[PDB]
Amino acid sequence: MKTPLTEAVALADSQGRFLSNTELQYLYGRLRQGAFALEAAQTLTAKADTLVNGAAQAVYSKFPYTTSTPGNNFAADQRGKDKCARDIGYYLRMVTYCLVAGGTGPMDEYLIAGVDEINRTFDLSPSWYVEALKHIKANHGLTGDAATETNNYIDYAINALS
Amino acid sequence: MKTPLTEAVALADSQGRFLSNTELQYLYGRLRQGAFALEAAQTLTAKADTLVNGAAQAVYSKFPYTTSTPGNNFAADQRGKDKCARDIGYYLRMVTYCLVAGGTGPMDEYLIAGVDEINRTFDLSPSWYVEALKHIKANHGLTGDAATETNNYIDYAINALS
Amino acid sequence: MKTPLTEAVALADSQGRFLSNTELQYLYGRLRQGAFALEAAQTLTAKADTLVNGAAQAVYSKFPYTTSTPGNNFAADQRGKDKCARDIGYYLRMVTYCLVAGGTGPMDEYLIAGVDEINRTFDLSPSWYVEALKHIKANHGLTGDAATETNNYIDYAINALS
Amino acid sequence: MKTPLTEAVALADSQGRFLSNTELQYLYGRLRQGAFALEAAQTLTAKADTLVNGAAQAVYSKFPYTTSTPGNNFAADQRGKDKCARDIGYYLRMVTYCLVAGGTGPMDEYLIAGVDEINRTFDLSPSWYVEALKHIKANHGLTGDAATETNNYIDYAINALS
Amino acid sequence: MFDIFTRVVSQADARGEFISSDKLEALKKVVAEGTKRSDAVSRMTNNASSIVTNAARQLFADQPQLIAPGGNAYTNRRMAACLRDMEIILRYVTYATFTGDASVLNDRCLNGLRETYVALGVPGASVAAGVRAMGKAAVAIVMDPAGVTSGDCSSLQQEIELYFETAAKAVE
C-alpha cells in the first residue's frame, strides 16, 4: 500500500502530528503525475492484448527450450502457453494498477513479496519475465512524460525480478 | 527536520528501497510550492521590521496590563519590550525559515518542542503570541497563492501555541 | 555450524545445565554414523574428478542452450565451462565436508544461506545444480549405510536448491 | 521432557528445518543405550522391594536421631517410616522411569524442580536421600553397561540433591 | 487504509480485468475535484482547536453533568482526555476526507471505539452530539469563502457531512 497520500497519512499518523503543508504539496504534485497517468492507463488498456501476445512471442523466441522440452513448468503443450498468457497478463495488469495508483504499492503487494519462493519452488526462471517486461517496455510506445514514468516503473519490475 | 525531500528519503530508508516513481513527483511538486515560496521569503525579509513593530504595537494595545503592571515577564520597562522585540523577531524568522524549507520542520524543531514548559515556568501567556501571529498574518499582505499558503503556515503556528 | 556435538553443547548452554546421560549417547550414536562416514569421505575423494567431469557432461547434455547461446552466465566459451567445473567442484567438496562433519552445518553455512540471491542476480538457474547433484547421487556408487546417509544428504542439497 | 528424540525435534523446530543425518544417528545411538536400558529397567523392577527396604535400613543406621527424636519430619513412629518408604520408593521409581526414557527429563521434571523448597520448608535434610541413593547404587548390582548408566544416572540424582 | 484510487484498483482486481472507461471518467472528475478535496481538509484543519473548544463548550453547556461532580468528564485529566478524544475524532475525519474515502476513518479509529466507550463507562450519545455540532462548524469553516478563489467547494460539504455522520453513528 504505497501511494503518496497514504504515506503522507502514515507519516502524520506515525508521528501523531496533524495534517500539514508538507503533506499538501504531494496532492498537487500528484497532479504532475496523474494528468498523464490516467491517459497512459487507458492507452495501456487499449494496447493490452497485442502486448501480451507479442511478449509471449518474444519469450518463446528467446528461449526455444521452453517450447521444446516437455515439462510442467515449460510451455510445451497448450496449457503451459495458457499459463504463460495468464502470467504475462497478470504482469501487465499489475503495471496498469501501479500506474493508476501512483506508487509501486499495488505492484509491490500483489507480485513482489512472494516471487522469490515461487520462482524457487516452481522452477520459473525470472529471466523469462525479464524478457516479457523488456518487450512490453519496448512495445508500449508511450509518448512524452507518460513514457518516462513507465520506464522508472517497468525498471522497478525488472529490478524486483533480478 | 520536515522537508518533503528528507521525508521521502526517510520513507525509502525505513522501507529499505530505492526512490520510486512517487518520490520523483514530490520534487516537481515542490516546484508548485517553491516557485512562489522563495519570492514570499524575500518579500517577508523586506516587510520584516515594520511587521515586528506593528506586532509589538498590537500586543501592547490588546493587553495594557503588560505595559502597566511591574514584573519580570511583563514589558513594563525598556528591557521587557526589548525581550518582546526579540521574541516576535524570532517568531517571524522561524516563519521565514519554515517558508524557505517547504515544511514545518524548522519551525517545529526550533520553536514548538519546548514552548509548553517555557510558557509554564516563565509565565508567558501564549495568547500574546497568538495576537502577534494574527497581526502578522493580517499585515503581511502577500499576493495570490503565496498568501494563502502563509496563512495556512501561520495557522499551524497558532495551533501549536493554542 | 550444525554437528551433533555442538548442538548438544548449545542445548546445555541455553538451559544452563551440564551434559546429562542423554547427551552422552549422542556421541556413541555418532559412532553408528562415523564408522562408515569417514570411509565414504575417502572414497568420494577418490571418485571426485570423474564425478565433476560426468556432472558437467550431464548438465551440458540436459541443457544444450547453455553451450549454444552466447552469454556471461552460459558456458558458451572455455571460461564459462571453467566456472562450471569450479561450481560443481565446490558442490562436491561441500558434500564431502558435510559428510565428514556429520551434520548439514558446513553445507548449510557455506552454500545455502546466499544461494537465492546469487541465483536471482547472476542468472544461475538452480535446476542446473539439480541435474548436477542428481548425477552425482546416481554416479557415486556408495556401498551400504554410507550410500543412504549421503542420499538423505544429497536430497537436502536439492531441497535447499529447489 | 528430556529424551534425545524430543530434543532433536526441539532443535529442528527452533531452527525451522527438517531432519538430517543426525536424527538417524541419534536414534540408532539410542540403540547403544536402549538395548541394555530396557533389560536394566526390568531387573530394577525385580530388585525394587529389597532395594527400598535396604535403603530404609541404611538411612536409619546412618542417622539414629531420626528414629529416636520425636517429630513430624523424623520417622519416630510408624507413619514416619511409612512416609520414608513412600519417599524412597518414589526415588527408585523415578530412577526406573529415567532409565526407560533415556534422559533425565522424567527425573528432572518429577523430582528436581521443587526439591529445594520442599527440603527447606518441610525440614527434610537431603543427605538422607544422599544415603538412600548411594545405598541403591551400591546394592543394585548391575553388571557392565548398566552400571555406567546408573552412576551417570544416580550421580546426577545426588548432584541435584547436593 | 484505502485511497479511492486504490479502491478502484482493488475492486478491479477482485473483478480481475482492466479499469473500465466509466470508472475512468469518474476518476478523472475525482482528479478535477481532488483540488477542492485536499485543501478542504486543510481548511477544516487550521481552526481545528477552536472548533474543538467550541464544540466542547457547547456540549458542557448542554449537559451540565459532565462538568458536575460524579460526571464522566469531571476531574481534570478526564476532561483533558475528553478534549483529546474529540481532537482525535476530528483529526481522523480530516484524514478520511483527505484520502477521499471513509475507510481510514472506519479502519483506524471508529471500530473498537464503540466497545471502548461502553467498557469505560463513557456516554456515547454525548460524543454523538459533539461530533454532529463539530461537523456543522467544520463545513461552514470549510464552506464560507473569505479571501479564497470562488470554487465548487459544495461537493466537499456533502462528503464531509457523510464522514461526520458515520463517525457519530459508529460511536453511538
Next chain:
Amino acid sequence: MFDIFTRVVSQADARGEFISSDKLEALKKVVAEGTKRSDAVSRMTNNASSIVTNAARQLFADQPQLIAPGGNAYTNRRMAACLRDMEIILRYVTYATFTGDASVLNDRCLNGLRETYVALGVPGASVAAGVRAMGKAAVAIVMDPAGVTSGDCSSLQQEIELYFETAAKAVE
C-alpha cells in the same frame, strides 16, 4: 510434546507403580520397530518439497478458484503462505511419526489451527483434501523400495495414515 517411552512413563506414574511386563514386551517390540519408524520419517522428508508441490498442483487443478482472482490463495504472498502452511503440516506430521506419538502433532500445530483458518476466512476442506493426497504420496514414497532392504513397514504405512488422518480431521 510426548515420546511414547514417556507416554508409558507418565501413564505408569499416574498409576503410580512400576512398568508392567506386558508394557515391556510392547516397548521392546517398539524398540525393534523404531528402526523402521525413525528413518521412515526421514524418507518421508526426503521428497518433502516435491510432495508439497505435487499436492498443491493437484489441489489447484481440482479447485480452480484458489488460483482464480477473488480466491483465498490468489495473490502471490497468499499462495506462498499456503505453500508454507502445507510444508508446516507435513513437517509436523513428520515430527509426530518420529516421536512415534501424535501428541506433538495435536500439541504443536493442529489445535488453534482450526480457529485460525476459520477466523482468516481460509477454507478448511481444501486443506483436508490437500493433507489426504499428501499422505497417500507420503506412505508410497516411504513404502516404495529403492536401494533399501525389503522389510515389513506395514505398521509405518499404518501409523502415518493415522497421523495424516488426524491432521486432516483436526483441520476440518
Next chain:
Amino acid sequence: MFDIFTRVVSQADARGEFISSDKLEALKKVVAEGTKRSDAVSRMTNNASSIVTNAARQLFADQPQLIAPGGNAYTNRRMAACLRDMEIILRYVTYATFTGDASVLNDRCLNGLRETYVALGVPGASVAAGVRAMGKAAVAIVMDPAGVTSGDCSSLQQEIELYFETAAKAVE
C-alpha cells in the same frame, strides 16, 4: 540528514539573520536545476542492478583473488554480502544526489564503514575501485541523451562524480 534548502536554513540560523539575496539567486537556480537533479537520481537507479553486477564482474576480473579460495569474497554468502554492500553504497549515493547534499551519504553510511571494513578484514582499495567504476557507468547512464529531451546536464555529471569520489575516498 540535510537538504540543501535546510543547509541554507541552518547556516542562516547559526548566522542568525534572514537569508540574503545572493543565497536566494543560488536557491532559485537550485530550484531551476533540481528538475535535472531528482530524476538524474532516478535514471541512475534505473539500471542500478546491471550497474552493480557489471562493476562486480569487472572487479572480480581485475582481482582474481576475491573469487579464489581464501579470498575475502570467496564463499557464497560473503560474495552475496559484497553485492549487498555495493548495492547499498550505490543506493546511498543515489539518496545523496537526491537530497542534493553529501550529508546523507557521509551521515548514513560512510562514517563507520571505514572501521567496519578494517575490523572485518575486508579490503578497502577493492571497494574504492568498485565505486569508481560504478560512478563512471552511473553518470554515463545519466549523461547519455537518448529517448529524452536534451538539455545541459553538466552540473549533475559534475556533482555525482563528486559524490562517488567522496564515497570511494571515505571507504579507503
Next chain:
Amino acid sequence: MFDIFTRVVSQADARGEFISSDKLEALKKVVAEGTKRSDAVSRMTNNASSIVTNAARQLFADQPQLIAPGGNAYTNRRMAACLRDMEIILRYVTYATFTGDASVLNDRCLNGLRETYVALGVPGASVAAGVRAMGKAAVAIVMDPAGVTSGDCSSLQQEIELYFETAAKAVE
C-alpha cells in the same frame, strides 16, 4: 563454537581443497577415541557438585581471608556467586572436552572473564588455584579406574589437564 570436525572443515576451506588423507587418519582415530572423550566428559560431570565444594572448601582453608570479613567472598550472596562461578568454569571446561576443542571454552566464558574479575575487584590468582585443584580431582575421577576396563587414557587425561590449564591461565 567449533567442533574438531569443523576445525578440520574450516581449515581445509581456508586452504580450499579437499581434506587430505593424513587428516583423515587423524580424524578416524579421533572417532575411535571420541568414545573415551564424550563419556569422559560425563564422568567428570558426575561428581561435579562434590568437586566444586571440595575445591572451594580447600580454597577457603588455604586463604582464610575470603571467608573473613572484608574479603571478596565474605557475605552470603558473594560466596554463593563464587560457587556459581566455579560451577560455571567447570561446566564450560566440561563442554570444551565434549566438543574436543578448547574453542568453546575460550569463546564462551574465558575471554571477558579476565576483565570482569579485574573490574569487580575479584582476585584472579585465587580462581587460578581453584581451577587447578578442581582439574586434579577432575581427571582422577576419570584417572582412577574402579570396577571398569583398563585403558590408555593417558592421551585424554592429557587433554583435560590442558583445558583446565588454559582456564586457569586465562583467568590470571
Next chain:
Amino acid sequence: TIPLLQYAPSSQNTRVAGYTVGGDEQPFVFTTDNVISDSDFDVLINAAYRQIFFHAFKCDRQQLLESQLRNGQITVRDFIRGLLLSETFIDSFYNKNSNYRFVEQCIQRVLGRDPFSEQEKIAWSIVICTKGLAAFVDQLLNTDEYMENFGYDTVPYQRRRSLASREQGEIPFNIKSPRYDAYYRSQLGFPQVVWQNAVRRFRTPDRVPQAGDPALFLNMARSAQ
C-alpha cells in the same frame, strides 16, 4: 501529559515464580553475546524473524539491521525495535488491525505474555494514536518486565507457556494471533463458497438392473468367448 490508566493485573503463568528446569518446552534462547560465529547469527536472525513477522520472506527482511547486527554495533533489543518500526510490520500488523488488537499482538510478541485484561489494551491504546508507533514501541521496550525477562541481549519468546507434566501448556501465540481478524477478512471478502456439492446434473437417473435382465449377463459375455 496524561498518564496511563491503572489497570489491575490478573493471574497468569508469568507473574508467578515457577520452578523452571531445562527441557524442550523451554524455548531455545538466542543471545547476541555467545553466538559469535557467522552461522549462529543466521539462526538468531531467523528466530527473531519467526517471532516478529512469523517466517518473514526475503521481501520482508531488512538488510541494514541484519548487516549491522552481524558486525555487532546493534543490540538485539535495538534490532527488535527496528523490526517493529519497519514497514513490513507496520503494513502487516498496524494497518490491518485496529489499535486494540494491535496492542494485544504487540504485547504478545515483544513482552512474551498475553495482556492481563481488555482494559490494559484499552489503556495502552491511548499512547499509540497520540504519540505514534515509535513512541509506543519505545515505551514498550523501556518497561522493566521486558528488561528483567529478556534484557538487552536476548530474543524474546513466549514465557512459561507450558507447565511441567502437561501434554499441552498453551497455544504458541504464533498460531493464536494472525495478522488478519474477522473484521478485515470481511473487507477482503474471502469466504466465497467452494460450491462443489449438489451441482444437480440433469441427465437421466441410472436404474439398477432388475432380476433376469439381459445386461446382467453382459459383463460375463464380454469375458467369455
